[PDB]
Design a protein around this ligand. Structure first.
Ligand SMILES: O=C(O)/C=C/C(=O)O
Ligand code: NA
Ligand code: NA
Ligand code: NA
Ligand code: NA
Lengths: 444, 432
């Protein structure tokens, strides 16, 4: 098979780099490993999580760490803060609080495709802030195909592709608003030690800008939906048992997540307060009987939770072997010749296009450690590159295979490959600007 | 709701013990917490895992530990050693290697009900060694009901309940052979730091003995009776994993002495199984019981809450005279007896999650090897044989809408007493 070969080709690459690199053994090991993992995660010949589990089992056998010390990465507070976000999402889906949020808002538009689709995007993004990205897409597709049936003429495609590609992007832009939403955010927060409200100060404003900037680009390429009528055909929804409760807990949780800084300070200064709140939410939702555990076990992506640990293990493997400082020495002249504009532009550009070929999180899982630790060897705060890398990681807008949401609206069997491949090629450039713009603004 | 009250009553209980107990404040906290958690886990007002997650958020807020230090319990090497067993199960089930293991064995009996039912038990136990207990029962139930169709006499119950209660017990007794099999076993290994081959030297002989003793009691009551793509690979990988797990002691030592070698072997299996393409991760993620994996961490955090607060030494001091008045026989007989019946009323693992920390840490304050009480407790925890709701395998063969509550309650009442003897018997021999 292909992937069995990519692994074999990668295994050879490691053995080659291992015996032939002419540096201090620690650097040779860290270099060989970083290459090995980079392939397995970008090619994905092996499952992201399988590669994640491979990270510790390597460091342990090659004397970098001891077994228990390596595994301890998989229990970082962010993992549980993310697992708390999973149970918080699983709750309002099994409860239907996502459905009622779509109807009550989508019915606010009386019957206009103009104010409908503009409401479909705002809801898809708002829902990605807390639930997910791949999950929010599948939940929206039937609601879009339902609306896009009055103008059911396929020969009227562009009226019916603008709404499909629009939500698939709003789900990705929504995941850039909060620490929960896309693993990349958690990978950055866990790498540089970000709080929920810390990452929101970065991503949310960026998403505020990217959503209009993204619709404008979608609008002014082939919008033909001004006229149209609504066919809300199905049983309406209605606030049932504790859908207000889930909203209350949710709102309460997000209130503590936002006001965690003063709440925690005016409480004794606990360590991972946001992680506790995420764990506290898991409790309230269970005491309030609103969600069973079987639900969370399905919704939770334990592979990403395992990936989180694998990514932190890598970050620590780069340091212990000095590969973080060795690469900073290697880039000394190169990076001194470059400006930080070129850097954040090269990085942003590199990822915003790199994420088109590989998984969103699999890209951050590899670059967030390298750039953060190398930025550290340079004595630079790994926050900027990490948040930057983590944000541009969720900027997959060209071909599918970049993000599941892309392949979700593509399986609708209507939007042409070429159609998507070129809207993202424009949006990618748009973000490289906005990001480098915002990345420059978020400086002083 | 019923359970919603237990929680409220338990919060009050904590406030009461907290405000009214007159001991060093730490003992009040550790005692209050131990009671709080003890209720939540035996009553199950909250899901086992919800209570487990409640442990760290408690210790963290009540200054016992720091958030990250508390959470670090959920990454113990035993947890990952068990996750390897899950991928090892998901592999050979998604491969179908468990069914073919039942067919190849079940057809070896030419056409005899006498040798038929006796073969259904041996496979349920063999499959519980590696797969699970609730899963081994549900996986066996269709295969068990299938045999009981030639002689389908309805009011021929005892001919048709001995085979149902036999597997429901063989699934629970089978899980006492290896560190993978039943969560209680893993809880002991994580508490006292046992290796895979260490726990097998203890449990496997006991499982060798308990299975016949269990069928004999059922017998002598009213008994009137293609190897495809890489199924050899799954079998190969599996065998390789178990070979390293057994010979891990010399293999690891003759390699540089890695720390949690069994955990490495367990994680290596997850890798071999994935490189060999024989099982996808979505399979491993489904078969894996992440709730139990989270529970493992919660139980270790409690154990550390008992020590950090001194409740282990306070209870060791409180039980000082009582245990000195008792022989070690009297102690392990009270203990063994205490659980073998407690496991009838509460979950198998929920019993070990609470008793293994308390007894192990107190036994340690006595300067005693906490292995015996811990391994003992973990074994007697899987001795639920009376009423249903003791173990899913019990409630699995019970949902057949045929086996009477009283019928099971008195065959198990015989097995329970039978086990209290066997356990205390072996527990006494395993001393010097
Ligand atoms: O291992 C199981 O399936 C169940 C264990 C228990 O409930 O004790
Ligand atoms: Na999201
Ligand atoms: Na991607
Ligand atoms: Na088992
Ligand atoms: Na039980």
């Amino acid at each position: 098979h292909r992937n069995s070969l990519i692994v074999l080709a990668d295994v050879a690459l490691f053995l080659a780099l291992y015996h032939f690199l002419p540096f201090e053994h620690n650097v040779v090991l860290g270099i060989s490993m970083l290459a090995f993992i980079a392939v397995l995660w970008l090619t994905e010949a092996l499952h992201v999580t399988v590669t994640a589990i491979l990270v510790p089992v390597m460091a342990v056998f090659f004397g970098i760490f001891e077994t228990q010390a390596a595994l301890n990465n998989f229990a970082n507070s962010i993992i549980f803060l993310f697992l708390g976000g999973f149970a918080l999402a699983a709750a309002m889906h099994h409860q239907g609080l996502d459905k009622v949020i779509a109807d009550k808002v989508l019915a606010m538009a009386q019957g206009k495709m103009s104010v409908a689709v503009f409401m479909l995007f705002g809801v898809t993004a708002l829902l990605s802030m807390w639930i997910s990205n791949t999950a929010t897409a599948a939940m929206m597709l039937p609601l879009v195909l339902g609306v896009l049936s009055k103008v059911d003429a396929d020969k009227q495609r562009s009226t019916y592709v603008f709404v499909l590609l629009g939500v698939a992007y709003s789900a990705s832009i929504g995941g850039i608003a909060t620490l929960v939403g896309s693993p990349p955010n958690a990978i950055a927060a866990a790498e540089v030690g970000l709080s929920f409200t810390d990452w929101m100060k970065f991503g949310l404003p960026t998403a505020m800008m990217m959503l209009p900037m993204a619709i404008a680009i979608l609008y002014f390429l082939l919008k033909p939906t001004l006229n149209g009528m609504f066919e809300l055909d199905r049983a309406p929804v209605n606030w049932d048992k504790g859908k207000v409760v889930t909203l209350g807990i949710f709102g309460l949780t997000v209130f503590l997540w936002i006001f965690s800084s003063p709440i925690n300070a005016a409480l004794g200064g606990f360590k991972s307060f946001d992680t506790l709140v995420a764990l506290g939410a898991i409790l309230m939702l269970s005491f309030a009987r609103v969600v069973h555990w079987k639900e969370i076990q399905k919704t939770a992506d334990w592979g990403v939770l395992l990936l989180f640990g694998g990514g932190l293990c890598l970050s620590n493997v780069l340091k212990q072997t000095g590969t973080s400082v060795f690469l900073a020495n290697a880039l000394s002249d190169m990076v001194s010749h470059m400006g930080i504009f070129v850097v954040i532009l090269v990085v942003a550009t590199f990822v915003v296009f790199l994420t088109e070929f590989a998984s969103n999180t699999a890209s951050a899982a590899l670059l967030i450690p390298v750039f953060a630790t190398v930025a550290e060897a340079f004595g630079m705060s790994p926050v900027l590159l990490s948040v930057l890398i983590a944000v541009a990681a969720s900027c997959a807008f060209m071909l599918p295979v970049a993000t599941p949401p892309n392949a979700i609206v593509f399986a609708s069997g209507h939007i042409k490959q070429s159609e998507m491949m070129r809207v993202g090629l424009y949006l990618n450039i748009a973000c490289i600007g906005l990001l480098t713009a915002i990345a420059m603004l978020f400086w002083q």
